[PDB]
A paper describes a structure:
We purified the full-length yeast [name] containing an [name] mutation, which allows ATP binding but blocks ATP hydrolysis, and assembled Vps4E233Q oligomer in the presence of 1 mM ATP in vitro. We used single-particle cryo-EM method to obtain the three-dimensional (3D) reconstruction of the 300 kDa oligomer without imposing any symmetry at a resolution of 3.9 Å. The structure appeared as a hexameric ring, consistent with the MALS result. Although we used the full-length Vps4E233Q for the oligomer assembly and the Vps4E233Q protein in the hexamer was intact as evidenced by the SDS–polyacrylamide gel electrophoresis (SDS–PAGE) gel showing a molecular weight of ∼50 kD, the six MIT domains exhibit no EM density, likely reflecting their dynamic locations due to the long linker of ∼40 residues between the MIT domain and the followed ATPase cassette (upper). The subunit A shifts slightly away from the ring centre, and the interaction interfaces between it and its two adjacent subunits are only about half of those between the other subunits. Moreover, the ring is not planner, in which subunits arrange in an upward spiral from subunit A to subunit F as manifested by the relative positions of the α3-helix and C-terminal helix in each subunit, resembling a split right-handed spiral ring. Agreeing with this, densities for nucleotides are clearly visible in the nucleotide-binding pockets of subunit B through F, whereas there is no clear density in the nucleotide-binding pocket of subunit A, suggesting that subunit A is likely free of the nucleotide. The inter-subunit interactions occur both between the large ATPase domains and between the large ATPase and the small ATPase domains including the β-domain.
The disassembly of ESCRT-III is mainly mediated by the [name] protein that is a member of the type I AAA+ ATPase (ATPase associated with various cellular activities) family and oligomerizes into a functional hexamer with elevated ATPase activity upon binding to ATP6. Powered by ATP hydrolysis, the [name] oligomer, promoted by the cofactor protein [name] (Vps twenty associated 1), disassembles ESCRT-III polymers into individual ESCRT-III subunits available for recycling. [name] protein contains an MIT (microtubule interacting and trafficking) domain at the N terminus, a single ATPase cassette comprising a large ATPase domain and a small ATPase domain with a β-domain inserted within it, and a C-terminal helix8111213. In this study, using [name] from yeast, we solved the structures of the ATP-bound Vps4E233Q hexamer at 3.9 Å resolution and its complex with [name] at 4.2 Å resolution, both determined by single-particle electron cryo-microscopy (cryo-EM) without any symmetry imposed.
Author numbering:
A (entry chain B), B (entry chain C), C (entry chain D), D (entry chain E), E (entry chain F), F (entry chain A): 119 to 437
């Protein structure tokens, strides 16, 4: 009957969300400011009902949705455009009706439709057959809630905003463009995870490597991080001949990963090695070089020409 | 069985609608006049059954309909593309038979069908099984009732008209085009959307606005209005200083933003001091100027070509 | 089982309807004639079953079916895909069976199926789930009435002829093409639809209007009539001053709309005038001229392009 | 539980059924021969298990089944696929098992399933799942096998052998393609339906009728004949003058319409002229000419594509 | 509580079943050879839980099963494919328990299931009622036969293999492919179906039968045989002329159809020939010239390709 | 999921895996090591989520997956991709997610997806909707959660590790090649195949057989063993006379196959052979030469080489 999707409590703060200040401003203004001071928004003015995030994949749109949901002080409705039901003799609209309707009585609430471009058909697709009932139903019901309930937030996280129909995006309110990460943002994104190996060289090297690794997405950064995690393990693959860097005064000889060519190295059962005698090497520049060697820029120039054209004619902020 | 949807009275005035006088009087002739003056309705005179609205979306079709909700002085039921269940396979038609049944036995009532383009068929293949019979039902319910005796009114509000079926088109009586509001109309939209704010110190400002802003609907204009309301709040959010120029007749001193180069002013922030002792400045021009610069027009010119093509097919007045 | 249709009685005469007396002759010959002269239909000469009406929308094929229904003297029942439909995801063949049988009980019977394309396809991919079963039943029932001897007359009215199936087409009688109204017919339809209103009766005016009104169905002409009827009401809503045109034979001084600077110009509003003294203005010539200035032509060619391909080498029968 | 379906049979000969002689001959082989000479089918040989007819619509395959039923001198069962169908939902195929049980319990019976395409064919749907069990039970009951078993001739008709299931085609025994008739067969078709009226009794006329036009089934020819018969009657409808062509030997003047320039011409209402005194006009070539000019030949080449793809490469007797 | 399924004893044996040497093999060691093993049944040899027969239609799976049932001398009850279903929508698996339990109670047992794909998929709909627990019940009963001594054997037979459910197959062992008979096998089948037919005993002519024919099964070959047998019937029916060939050694005057150009040929009709005096002529190559041209195969290559991907994918280990 | 998925606590051990050095390297660092020492990883290093097992068919990838699942005593859930593509028209996302939920509820489980390749296919048509969304869904679920709860392990299996996730193309994670067994391994598998039963020839003969087979699989060997079990069978069938074994040891006469004339060849026929007197002899070279004869080459040729090409290219880590 209901089939309601649960909303967990993820821990992503504003300090974790690196870069893009204007979006943060828009979101605080959108949700946090009316929660902080409600009597200001009265009479004529009403809060932003339909905020649109857009950009290429892996850039932290879902991550920002989760971030807002962390510091919401409110309910949430996580849902994908495709993943609930899709074409079974029609009827994928009742789900929407129960979604919005059950968001009405529970005031201050945040809806999130992941990838709205999947609903609309660019050539024909389901939009010719039965998905017109979806596109219509969303189009009508999104405005009917803000007419009745007054200020129920719907957050757009589309990848393809220009194939998307013009009728949806004019009913949907202000836009938020997501460009590629900049100096400070990429920099801080390196020092979030791990932190057991006590840093690397000074922050100038994070900027040098940063400018070398500029143009990467958030997922690309995550993959770099994962690579760096796996680096000492692939250094363990090459070893099987363990040297002790420290002295013999400790409880056990600290086994470092290294080749047999280096002196003072001996072999043993690598499977049955305890954690205390293990020791990771320092994270070298070759981590970033292996990252580079994975064929990086998914964000190519010719594809995002359209992104930046559909950007500039509306711009920062928007509808 | 019954499936009641609307039983409310949202307050909308006569003067809220701006563009086209003849478009309003078309409805007024068609809706209120026969109920008000039934003695005139005798013999050869027949009621204007069916009032379709069309045009580029955002301009004010749904808004017009929901104005009519206040202006009707009678019970009515809206409906989207939400004919319920085909899991049973049979009840989809019977719901329409109930819908048309619940309209006619109750004396003068209305039915609002949002987005008639969804309920459309012509190519067939996939339509034949499920929705072809729905379209046929739609056709057959407004076939015999159209002439002689009729206590029902049909309404329509589509995004794009030309994809609709020919049979529904020609058989439906009164279609109306809703263009982009002119300088006087949009000015009137500005004037009404001022509301409870303490005035604006100019009359030519509206002219400046509506002349500069070209190719805007009611929606995005109201969005701009919302923005320009939330501008001085942002000014307050950035600004710290306050020179005491508050009246003694009020309950207490009220915080308003002032310039840094101005002596005798406390610099305690909006966050520290209470919100009940806060004040917003009067609306300027520059807030609207920058609001225009942020919010560029949503309605593209390429979409209007086929709109006007449909107009020169059928036009402002129905048929 | 007992859920039957109600037989209403709209007084539609033969001489009132215009457009093709050959069709009328086919109808009378099929329906009324054998009731009239039953001895003339005894032997090889027989009344064939299944006269198909079709054409563009709003041309009056449904209305012509009602014209048969009026003067047939027939205990008839008509139904589209409303009552006769599957309910339990299965059986709607019995409904056809007892439908035909309950028509076979009283044998001055006509069965009118409005929009036969609803209960028809061609292959349908997964048509065996439902529609093939009912369609097949329909096919198998009227085999015995198509030729040989049975006293039932089937009728049909559809806008899309090519989507109708071959095997149904060869089960059916003569398919009478109903085109758009022509000069003389159209000319007739003006004064008949207007009724007994004072409409300055001269045939030259009808000649002129009929000349000017090119490319119009029958329904749109009734809409035009309706517009012309609504016109003097509109003048009543734009009537500032009134004057007594008629003499003092009636009980009160009868007031009718006039020019502002006229003799005896009473200033009270149109709503304040009582029904006994409220007299509508007489119908002019230019009211129609302006009506057709507002009322643009109805007939789009795109639908008729296939009918141009049809009517030449198809038209009468399949072919 | 028991519900038998048996009906009376009027006169239908072998001679009047025009078409392929081998098809009729094959039916003689399958029907009359085993009853006449049963000792021939005792040992190696067995009677024909089943013959499925197929072709374009209105070709007389149902009429052929009728003819066989007349000339069988046996218990002729005839029932469609969707007639015997589950009302209860639980029980379903037991109706079929009782039916073929009835076929077994009576000595050599003949079964007829009109439109076999209703069931049989499916593309992984299973006709709403539940009715796949009928599809399945039809095979396991041992009807279509070409080995051993009781002599029970199952018959059928279909317009779509490509939609028909391959496994059943392979299972069920013999096919007969029913083609469209040629000069000779068509000529016969003309010369049968005559009756009391002696039109123009020569072979030149019928061979002109057959030679001029082309592309006919059997039902359309019948329709044409009917039209031709009705021609003089509709000419009696438009009868101004009257003439006594009949001799004085009769009881009263058997009147008929005539040309204006005639000796002893009289004018009155044609309705008052009774059956005994109404001499009908004799039929002519021009009557058939006008018949043709109204009633077109009814064959379409789009149906012949998928038919001939099933036939032309193979020839006769099936796929 | 009547559970008396039709026990029968056909006259088919291993000698008159041509082709499928591997299948004949695999059934010999699955049943009859295990009947001769009441000592080395379990231990070395793993007994078969179930045998799946699959392939194109008309290959002879049912025929094979029946032959087996004749041969083995076992308590056999071939299941009704569809009828194991809830009549009252309550009891259902009681019938399964009646089947399997009584099949266990006499342990020279065989259970044959023609069309195991009757339990077709799921798709929701009406499968969730008693059919779900039928599906489960099959699985519990085949877990029942898995335990204890394997007297019962699940002989799976189906036309469409891929539509059968996964979970049945995953708990199922033996899968014997049944292809179309090759040249030798087809020749031997012809030889079998000849039997007691006059003459035609030359191996070059049986080559000739085998050579021209391509891609056939047992059903269509039987049909061909039947046709061949019916040729001399037609040659009797056509030939009016006759002559006595038999001498005084034969007692009865054996009448037989002579050549047309024959001196002193009596011309009494074929219908006047009595049973005692009849003599039908011997078969020739002329019969097979007409048979091969007339009769033709059904199933396409693509079905066999589906069987080849089923062959390559499924069959091995536990698929 | 309604018995489509297998579940058990398997007890499959390292000792039964003959020489799979690759598994023994990769799994022991990826899975076993984290099980042993969870705290052994510095920073945010967390266990592998997905492992692809890839190689030719019949290497017991299932056996290996079960052995992996044996180590934590983890529940082994497993499902076939092929099986849920065509039957349902797989929109199984909701059920996959529920599956994951239920498996997550049970503390560490392992998910096994067999033939992951069957999901891929950039073909087009209606297959797109039943493939593309599954592929998208697969690529989301492979990193559906950010470590934390996907310590629960996904094992993919493929025989054709080209085309999409297994291939050069994109994504996955750590992959392992599962090679065919070498001579020694195959010999050990022969040693482990079934439970012998009375006496065979030498382990070196089996090495000879294993030497004779290059590129043949564990499954091919299992086919040879299934053929081995039929050696006594085919002895029973093919010999006409047998020879006595019972000297002074056995109580009753017991036979082995020989030629008709031999020293101690009993003379009654194979058909006569009673239960007790039947005795399978030892399996000799001649029985295995006959096994060599009756096992044709199994294996596809070009895939081996392509997978060697991918092995040379990739294998280490994700792509
Ligand atoms: N501004 C940011 N600050 C820190 N981390 C980020 C930022 N943007 C992206 N990331 C990282 O990228 C990872 C994945 O990004 P995410 O999947 O949210 O992108 P997405 O565009 O929403 O993808 P999809 O549209 O497919 O859901 C996150 O785990 C997060 O750590
Ligand atoms: N030939 C005519 N004579 C008189 N009135 C007509 C004629 N044609 C149309 N009308 C008027 O216009 C209306 C036509 O409506 P109607 O529903 O019959 O059109 P239709 O084409 O049959 O509809 P559909 O396409 O649904 O079958 C009628 O109410 C009738 O009064
Ligand atoms: N060869 C023929 N001889 C005599 N009458 C014929 C012949 N062919 C057609 N007819 C006449 O025309 C009609 C044909 O209708 P019938 O249903 O028998 O054809 P059909 O091919 O079975 O149609 P369908 O395939 O649509 O069921 C019959 O009523 C019959 O009187
Ligand atoms: N090897 C054979 N020898 C003799 N006759 C055969 C052979 N194979 C098939 N036939 C004949 O063809 C017919 C095949 O019918 P059968 O029902 O056994 O095929 P099937 O594939 O099981 O069909 P279904 O699956 O629809 O039951 C049998 O009646 C039999 O006479």
């Amino acid at each position: 009957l209901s089939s309601a999707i649960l909303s967990e409590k993820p821990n992503v703060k504003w300090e974790d969300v690196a870069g893009l200040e204007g979006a943060k401003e828009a979101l605080k203004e959108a949700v946090i400011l009316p929660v902080k001071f409600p009597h200001l928004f009265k009479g004529n003015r009403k809060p932003t009902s339909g905020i649109l995030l857009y950009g290429p994949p892996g850039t932290g749109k879902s991550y920002l949705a989760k971030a807002v949901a962390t510091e919401a002080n409110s309910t949430f409705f996580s849902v994908s455009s495709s993943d609930l039901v899709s074409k079974w003799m029609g009827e994928s609209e009742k789900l929407v009706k129960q979604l919005f309707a059950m968001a009405r009585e529970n005031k201050p609430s945040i809806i999130f439709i992941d990838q709205v471009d999947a609903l609309t058909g660019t050539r024909g697709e389901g939009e010719s057959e039965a998905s017109r009932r979806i596109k219509t139903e969303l189009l009508v019901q999104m405005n009917g809630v803000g007419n009745d309930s007054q200020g129920v937030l719907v957050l757009g996280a589309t990848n393809i905003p220009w194939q998307l129909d013009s009728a949806i995006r004019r009913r949907f309110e202000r836009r938020i463009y997501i460009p590629l990460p900049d100096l400070a943002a990429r920099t801080t994104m390196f020092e979030i995870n791990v932190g057991d190996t006590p840093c690397v060289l000074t922050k100038e090297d994070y900027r040098t490597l940063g400018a070398m690794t500029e143009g990467y997405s958030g997922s690309d950064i995550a993959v770099v991080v994962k690579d760096a995690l796996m680096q000492p393990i692939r250094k363990i693959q090459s070893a099987t001949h363990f040297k002790d860097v420290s002295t013999e005064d400790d409880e056990t000889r600290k086994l470092t990963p290294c080749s047999p060519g280096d002196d003072g190295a001996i072999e043993m059962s690598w499977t049955d090695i305890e954690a205390d005698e293990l020791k990771e090497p320092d994270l070298t520049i070759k981590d970033f070089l292996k990252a580079i060697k994975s064929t990086r820029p998914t964000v190519n120039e010719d594809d995002l020409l359209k992104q930046e054209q559909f950007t500039r004619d509306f711009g920062q902020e928007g509808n």
